[PDB]
Symmetry: D2
Subunit: 295 residues, 4 copies
């Protein structure tokens, strides 16, 4: 038999970093979870029990901490590029590094209208993520994303005009609840290496911010024809506002809220325009995906 | 053998309610998860296969929706009291109702600095909870709580002066990270029944707010001697600000962030005053509990 | 204000122990998760910032490992008693120790019909648990339990004869699916101390085994009138087979499987006696509890 | 902008099916969770608000139940092929169907050494999975897998001979614990369509069984040089025993169990050959992947 593909590394490496301003006394914290997987001339560790080609995953973990000690950890797109570049420059037989980072929220607390210098709150479970692929002789590919952004609108969602055949029982509607957990990814144009990534550093936070804002405002303002239609609108705007983005992908569940017919009880009216109490459904859920690119 | 205790009901009943202002066009949503357990003269369902004494848990679920249709669902302390009172008044053989409610966050979105009329965000996984016990001839006992409030301060926590013996390896410190997930419960004085609960309705939201504020400000401002000392300070204030509270209980994990010694690598200095990169620990964790009452 | 109650300690302490038979070469492993909470004359750590009364939770963790090194870790009822007794004997101001243990399954693998000497499988997520309360001058109270035992029977469950009023929509049935996750606790008579617990050591594993067997056989053989009726039958048997048990408690969800009406499609018959495809419901669920004691 | 890729459907569709033998009275149950995502000429639902091209995800759900009513649901490789073929044959504009199925364990109980006719136990959280891609004019691609198989061996694992540089702190060892959660996937040769899949039906369960057996026996018997080496051995055997398999992929975490140095306490010896108590580590973990194909 033959090794067709192989990668190995360390997952679930939790990292905290604090930045302390002597001058102001203000502290700023960063917490992430890191995955690093390596590819290279390592097939003999699998086939021949040759561990000489293995950079121990324990050493990978060490490297993550040391790199965080010696470099900025923000924006995550920069830190991931620095970490992956290290592995391929450092080891002659390692030719690709795959770095995934999840950035956890630590939002500064405001106490008495004043931001506190060293106290933070996890204000949501929403994440900011990066996937960075560093490949010898092919540059640095970065996919940035937000995930875990949970939203609901209580009206101004519609779904009518869909295919109707003998498998269909769903009624057309002109007014429903729409709720989802947003997963949005923007894929950057290939970068030639670290210098190029460093030259674009301000764009990373700005674009994350823009993707978030557009996502929020479009969801809230669109009188949605369907999940499909609304998510296309978000993707189009982001592409229009950042030219270094090649594609935008969205993955949106439809988390259903069902009406409850209470007419069996004292003629109680709780459907259609009288609908006030609903049953949120844990499963199943619609799942709608789109990848939008440039024309 | 003999039935010493028995309760039965329905758990994990998810409920959504929307309120719509004709006038303004503003919509407001509520989402909760409800548990209702009943006690009474029901032992023969266990011992004799007598189902006649059983109010089907399916009917309990129905009752939850109908009650939500016909009554306010906020504050949860009121809605739980109304729901539990129903069961004991309605069924002659049911003498206690236990209602647990978890209130989920749906915070109105602000778009362009303007609050949106019908779009919401789950801005955190923090919950507002109530436990309501309705007991025939003994009134209504309510425990209110907040849970899932996750915080961190990066300095102004200490821990020195603890017992040292042959089981001790922990070093005293005058500067550490302190992070926790706050669970805080305030127990109301017994209420005689629904009228009394309705007369105090404005106090429920106000007290939740106060408990939250005090928790936040004390955590941020206290130069903490230990988790014990800091949580006592929070409990004392809440009791001072709401006289209808008999006790306050706190349950606080200590989620450890460990220093990482990097001196083995190029003499890198990452401990004590040079500590910048830390390893968050998933387990084990300290767990500190306090119940504070009136003197 | 005043401290009404206080306890503190360490949670989520994971422990592995291996036992190695020189003679046979057979190895046996144990893995548990331990919680230890202490009570005593410790109020001044809360009120006065007096850490001198605090046995650091870090030291508690150390103590757990050392105790496991020097004593048997099985049965968990014995190990918990030894651990809690340590704290109250060792520290003059500590008067109660609360030890919770979760025992994780590592079942020996059989390879080629032969049990392997050192390879194991987590054959299920079912747990064996103990809660041990060690109180100065009041002995040792032990509650043993099994949890996470998930079962289903596809027929020979009934539910008819329940209360019917204007909140009822559930139809009586003489044939349904019954599925649950078993939580069963047996509470031992108070023990005077460690000697007494050691004298009963063989009974702990035997009784766990009996509780499991009875639970399984009764669920499978009872033509169940309801969850109530069936669980009473299990509790009664266990009490009959172990006299040192004072009470048995069961907590059983009813995890509903709903019929699906497919008659709207080509007159397809999938209800009642033609019911073949069902929709498992994630929520809500019935919840039925019983505590059975001696007459 | 332009739609580069699009798929939509229904996720988390839970399904139960029972099979009842009139003759024997024996019942057999199946429970799965189904995801179906469709691709086709559906871009205008995204760009033009044209819902006419949309087969409602609600109808997809209906279709899953109806198909399960009218066809075998086992082996999952067959049921997935039947379901995906339906969508592409039925709808002219739908050209690919992606079906993912998770098969949940319901193992027949043995009571008194006799298998029970209608009672089952979830004997483990291990899953059997399939991914089936049905593409108009390109046949049926099936990936089969097992996941959630958690194992541990307490000796006969080694790790020495790895790369050592200034990032390395890990000590070589000739005796350690090895624990993992097995994820193994076998990819079938492309099938031309349903007839071909039906002709190979007996091979699906047999191969799942073989992959399981080989995985178990190799883990238990290999004096492992590393995770890499051991997993290569498993993949090679499976390929040798089933010729219709093109590739085998394994994804194996290394769930670390750390020694604990107790020498600081009364010279207690708990390392190296005296190692008896270990601390299981929740994170980070090694992650090792391999795809093995034919030479
Ligand atoms: N995964 C292995 O086989 N050995 C590993 N354990 C470590 O700590 N580093 C490795 O690379
Ligand atoms: N729990 C039972 O035994 N029967 C129950 N199922 C329901 O739907 N209502 C009950 O009370
Ligand atoms: N919980 C605290 O305030 N300090 C604690 N951290 C520890 O490691 N031991 C304690 O008791
Ligand atoms: N996802 C949507 O926009 N509408 C959907 N809801 C459904 O129930 N079926 C759909 O396709």
């Amino acid at each position: 038999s033959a090794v067709k593909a192989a990668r190995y590394g360390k997952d679930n490496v939790r990292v905290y970093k604090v930045h302390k301003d002597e001058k102001t006394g203000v502290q700023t914290v960063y917490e992430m979870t890191v995955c690093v997987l390596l590819e290279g001339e390592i097939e003999t560790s699998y086939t021949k029990a040759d561990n000489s080609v293995i950079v121990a995953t324990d050493s990978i973990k060490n490297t993550i901490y040391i790199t965080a000690k010696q470099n900025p950890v923000t924006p995550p797109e920069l830190f991931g590029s620095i970490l992956g570049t290290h592995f391929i420059e450092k080891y002659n037989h390692i030719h690709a590094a795959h770095v995934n980072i999840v950035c956890h929220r630590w939002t500064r607390m405001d106490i008495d209208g004043k931001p506190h210098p060293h106290s933070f709150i996890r204000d949501s479970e929403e994440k900011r993520n990066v996937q960075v692929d560093v490949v010898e002789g092919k540059g640095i590919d970065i996919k940035s994303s937000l995930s875990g952004l949970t939203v609901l609108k209580s009206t101004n969602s519609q779904f009518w005009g869909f295919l109707r055949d003998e498998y269909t029982t769903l009624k057309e509607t002109w007014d429903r609840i729409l709720s989802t957990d947003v997963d949005a990814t923007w894929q950057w144009k290939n970068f030639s290496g670290l210098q190029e990534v460093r030259s674009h550093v301000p764009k990373f936070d700005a674009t994350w911010a823009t993707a978030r804002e557009v996502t929020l405002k479009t969801f809230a303002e669109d009188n949605s024809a369907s999940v499909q239609a609304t998510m296309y609108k978000m993707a189009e705007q982001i592409l229009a506002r950042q030219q270094l983005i090649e594609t935008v992908e969205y993955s949106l569940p439809n988390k259903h809220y069902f009406e409850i017919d209470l007419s069996w009880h004292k003629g109680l009216q709780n459907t259609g325009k009288n609908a006030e109490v609903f049953a949120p459904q844990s499963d199943p859920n619609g799942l709608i995906k789109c990848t939008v690119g440039r024309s």
